[PDB]
């Protein structure tokens, strides 16, 4: 059903993220791990993004989405929710779209392309398709590993969740 479909989709996208394999001298490119997109970057149809969308009842969420189009006439994206239950294709300004990384960084060769401990990020929360503010708790040690993060969470007396794991595909800058 829907719940299984969604969680499978997340795994597919996280696992298939290619690892950046440079040779001596090469630097990790924009959109490898934590390396930001170039200024004026425009994501392509099919690219995964975090997209800041409002509901009809007003609450803003960063959702997992895919680019459908970009109009240079209006400087707006169209994006589709990764969930089929999200029946609205959203028109969004650039500041409402964060491209997900297109490579994983290998901690063993390019650790500068990982977020540092205690950096603020947006991260996909487990069992959801949405991104929320978190601090990095630990970077991945090996290419297969997730980050661990502490989500901001007001249900905890100290305001943070326990460490929760999030794949490199699903951790982006919070600016």
């Amino acid at each position: 059903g829907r719940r299984g479909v969604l969680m499978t989709l997340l795994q597919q996208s996280a696992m298939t993220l290619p690892l950046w394999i440079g040779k001596p001298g090469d630097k990790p490119p924009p959109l490898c791990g934590a390396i930001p997109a170039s200024g004026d970057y425009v994501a392509r149809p099919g690219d995964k993004v975090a997209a800041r969308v409002k509901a009809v009842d007003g609450d803003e969420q960063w959702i997992l989405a895919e680019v459908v189009s970009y109009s240079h006439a209006t400087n707006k994206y169209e994006v589709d929710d990764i969930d089929e239950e999200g029946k609205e294709r959203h028109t969004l300004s650039r500041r409402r779209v964060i491209p997900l990384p297109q490579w994983k960084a290998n901690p063993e060769t390019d650790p500068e392309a990982l977020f540092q401990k205690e950096q603020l990020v947006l991260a996909l929360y487990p069992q959801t398709t949405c991104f929320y503010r978190a601090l990095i708790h630990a970077p991945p040690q090996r290419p297969q590993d997730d980050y661990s993060v502490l989500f901001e969470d007001t249900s905890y007396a100290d305001g943070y969740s326990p460490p929760l794991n999030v794949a490199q595909r699903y951790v982006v800058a919070c600016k």
């Binding site: 959702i63 969930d83 959801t128 398709t129």
Partner: peptide, 5 residues
């Protein structure tokens, strides 16, 4: 989308 509950 599925949000945090």
């Amino acid at each position: 989308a599925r949000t945090k509950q």
